[PDB]
Design a protein around this ligand. Structure first.
Ligand SMILES: *[C@@H]1O[C@H](CO)[C@@H](O)[C@H](O)[C@H]1NC(C)=O
Ligand SMILES: *[C@@H]1O[C@H](CO)[C@@H](O)[C@H](O)[C@H]1NC(C)=O
Ligand SMILES: *[C@@H]1O[C@H](CO)[C@@H](O)[C@H](O)[C@H]1NC(C)=O
Ligand SMILES: *[C@@H]1O[C@H](CO)[C@@H](O)[C@H](O)[C@H]1NC(C)=O
Ligand SMILES: *[C@@H]1O[C@H](CO)[C@@H](O)[C@H](O)[C@H]1NC(C)=O
Ligand SMILES: CC(=O)N1CCC[C@@H]1C(=O)O
Ligand SMILES: CC(=O)N1CCC[C@@H]1C(=O)O
Ligand SMILES: CC(=O)N1CCC[C@@H]1C(=O)O
Ligand SMILES: CC(=O)N1CCC[C@@H]1C(=O)O
Ligand SMILES: CC(=O)N1CCC[C@@H]1C(=O)O
Ligand SMILES: [Ca+2]
Ligand SMILES: [Ca+2]
Ligand SMILES: [Ca+2]
Ligand SMILES: [Ca+2]
Ligand SMILES: [Ca+2]
Ligand SMILES: [Ca+2]
Ligand SMILES: [Ca+2]
Ligand SMILES: [Ca+2]
Ligand SMILES: [Ca+2]
Ligand SMILES: [Ca+2]
Lengths: 204, 204, 204, 204, 204
């Protein structure tokens, strides 16, 4: 219930402590989802963008940046990776959807679709998650790793319990996202832990 | 008899099992043909795009991607290769024609002609093929190789028993192909085997 | 009290001793500041752009170019670094701000914001500085290092005791800078030491 | 005489056999000449573009591609080479002129002049040539070398017994060449030997 | 007293002999000068562009190209070098000025200023020079070096006994140079020695 429109979280340093917890009242396992957000980082090493863990389940839903031009999604421990030509460093808009019935994961980078990949067909992503920005969880809420920490800025984060069609991905990219029912940047419940600063978004 | 307009086959993972069989009424050997399709893959290793084998004849008609920027056509186990400047990764539209009387092979990449090459002048491509997408055949219908598997998306596949002139190549590229009499994306008989998913084409 | 409009300092050679002292009656420690200037150098080795030391304190406020595309700010010996795509050699406009309350350092290169970083939250930059262009200080006013010397041209330098908003940054870059209260190019007090020549600015 | 307007010779494979003989009625030594043609090849090794030998005299007039971006002219066994930034692979339009009185050779690539070079000032290129496309001659009409063979397509070839000024070079590049008196694509006397196929020009 | 408007000197081969002597009415030592000319060469090795020697003094005023993207000026055997982004091979317009009072050398490449450098403050360039294009002098008029020879084309050369302001540099670049009192392409006294050919300028 905080509207962060026009603002970003800044993770201004590398650490094993700095992070934001995102709170969602999700109690039903997910068959489908889409996650979109905007990020600006000049890290060359790998890092976690979005870490969603549940009780007894590490890497239940994880968006991980392997290196420049390579984006990975983990579902239930398994992963897929797709490549893109991108400038570095540069602000980026990232969406990824996943659909249990087919296992298909769709990444979109700056409104451009990456090659589809597939994993975990028939799997249900569990609910009552702990969701962390800034660090990658290895436990339910913790066990961070400095070498996976995100340094930079994140904004405009939305998560839906459905697979967005292309037009709705583009809406989000263009700054007019459709209402989101899992996480909503315009009505976000979060906890800052450590050194995270909220600043205006100046790089769009 | 299936209309796949606006859809693609997604081969969402590397494997030695996942493939699509394409079924054609072909009992007469081929003197002339054109084959067009659209593909999107972020593999950098080599892979088969279109594998056509006949009884006792490996690589009877094979479209094979050597590496970024290099496309090969095999006719009757002989091969030619032509080069092109292309982005990686990127969607591509590929056409290739071959004419027995001259032996000339013409590749067209995104509506741009590659340098013509020639092979097997006077040869007839054998009939009663097994045609496979997703894997490269070494037997009549099988003996696949994981290191040659296609991971990504293929759509808009057409095959004609004639050599198309440039305007019809361009028309296919532009999404208004001439009706095709060997294989036709709008009236396709196919068999999915293993993990292959049909999805909307979102990258044109 | 000198108007350097349309002029630059030229540091025309590598040396250990050529430099300009910038004089400001700065008696109270700084909680906030912004520094903007234009520079043109074809050095590929590291160099100091702006060196501010106080008695007994090295690198109290230092803007340092590590290598092409990498800009560093030191506050009380601690540093942050941010990256940018830039041409080399090329003239550049650089602004950097820092805010004690948040620790946030903002670099802007040719009116483009770099990724925010953060350091020294709650700190105050010490007053009574010696401020040097052309050389990096390791003592209070001296102990230079030719391998860190700046060779090239600097102009349009301003320093304010506040964090400028983006509109004021862009005005400095391409419009009328807001008059500045610590250092101001239209009313600058300076001392030339060694081989430094004032010339018209010809590269904007 | 044959009008090859809108057509090309296709040398579809590497060989020591495949070539075209061109026949001119001139029957005089050459003091001045210009030669223009279009070519499209994806060879990265060296190759002969135009080979003119006379009785007992190798490399009497030879246009030879050393590697991407490097064009050589031999006159009377001596050579010059000039460089250009060019795309690879790509269609190219090539003109070269030579003037005995000055020795000056001018290459023009896609209507752009390369650096002038000079050779054989005062020499007369011998009369009664054998002129070959597709292979490099080492004898009067033969002694080819597969490692110097041209694989690809050639069209729009014209040769004049004078040095064309820039405006006439550009006319040739644009597809409105002045009528030519040594060799003329619109009234060409030629002999195909081995595997050379005439096809429509599809790459302009 | 020869008007070379629209023409260039072509140095069509590497040699230790080919050169042009430029003859000037200059008789007093030089405190200030500007030298502009256009050049086109595809040499990648080092070479001399303009060699001005006086009795007993090598490298009295020398414009030397170290390698692509790097231009050097020698005054009285001392050297400065400045860098630029340039295409290779490509025609270039080069101006360089030097002012004894400050020691400042200003290179301009295609109307774009390079970083200023400084040398020989207070020095007077000696009079009664021998000025050579095509070779680098090590004696008063001679002692050439094949590995420093200029191969290619030079035109539009002007030398003034003052430091030109930017507007006048740009005029020369654009083809409307001010009349020049040391050397002037429209009223030039020169001696061709060896293989140098005058041709029309075709690459502007
Ligand atoms: C998941 O999404 C698909 C469309 O992608 C939809 O057809 C399906 O009903 C969704 N499943 C659930 C449980 O909402
Ligand atoms: C194949 O093409 C050639 C030339 O285009 C033509 O002569 C021949 O009839 C074609 N063959 C068939 C069966 O159409
Ligand atoms: C400086 O900005 C701070 C935040 O660091 C702000 O709260 C304060 O008012 C400013 N301090 C001064 C001396 O202007
Ligand atoms: C070749 O060109 C030169 C120009 O130098 C001219 O003098 C000469 O007559 C030309 N030769 C012929 C046969 O036209
Ligand atoms: C050289 O230039 C300076 C300007 O800095 C000028 O004062 C001086 O007179 C010039 N010398 C001559 C002989 O013109
Ligand atoms: C161990 C490791 O490198 N990674 C990469 C992201 C997921 C997984 C982890 O830390 O849990
Ligand atoms: C053996 C091999 O490397 N290749 C490449 C494509 C055709 C052929 C094959 O697998 O049959
Ligand atoms: C020691 C060193 O390499 N540096 C780089 C700039 C700051 C610091 C110094 O010279 O004081
Ligand atoms: C021997 C050789 O390498 N060459 C290159 C072209 C001309 C010459 C020849 O084969 O005759
Ligand atoms: C010796 C040498 O390499 N050089 C480079 C230019 C100046 C100087 C000379 O030849 O005189
Ligand atoms: Ca984990
Ligand atoms: Ca971890
Ligand atoms: Ca096979
Ligand atoms: Ca195989
Ligand atoms: Ca220091
Ligand atoms: Ca130091
Ligand atoms: Ca030969
Ligand atoms: Ca040969
Ligand atoms: Ca010398
Ligand atoms: Ca020398």
């Amino acid at each position: 219930h905080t509207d962060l429109s026009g603002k970003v979280f800044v993770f201004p340093r590398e650490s094993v402590t700095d992070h934001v917890n995102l709170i969602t009242p999700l109690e039903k396992p997910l068959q489908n989802f889409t996650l979109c957000f905007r990020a600006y980082s000049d890290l060359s090493r790998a890092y976690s963008l979005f870490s969603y863990n549940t009780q007894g389940r590490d890497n239940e839903l994880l968006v991980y940046k392997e290196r420049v031009g390579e984006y990975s999604l983990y579902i239930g421990r398994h992963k897929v990776t797709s490549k893109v030509i991108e400038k570095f460093p540069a602000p980026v808009h990232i969406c990824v959807s996943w659909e249990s019935s087919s296992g298909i994961a769709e990444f979109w980078i700056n409104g451009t679709p990456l090659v589809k990949k597939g994993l975990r067909q028939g799997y249900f992503v569990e609910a009552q998650p702990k969701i962390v920005l800034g660090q990658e969880q290895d436990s339910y809420g913790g066990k961070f790793d400095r070498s996976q920490s995100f340094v930079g800025e994140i904004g405009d984060l939305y998560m839906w319990d459905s697979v967005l069609p292309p037009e709705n991905i583009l809406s989000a990219y263009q700054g007019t996202p459709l209402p989101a029912n899992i996480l909503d940047w315009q009505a976000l419940n979060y906890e800052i832990r450590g050194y995270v600063i909220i600043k205006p978004l100046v790089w769009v």
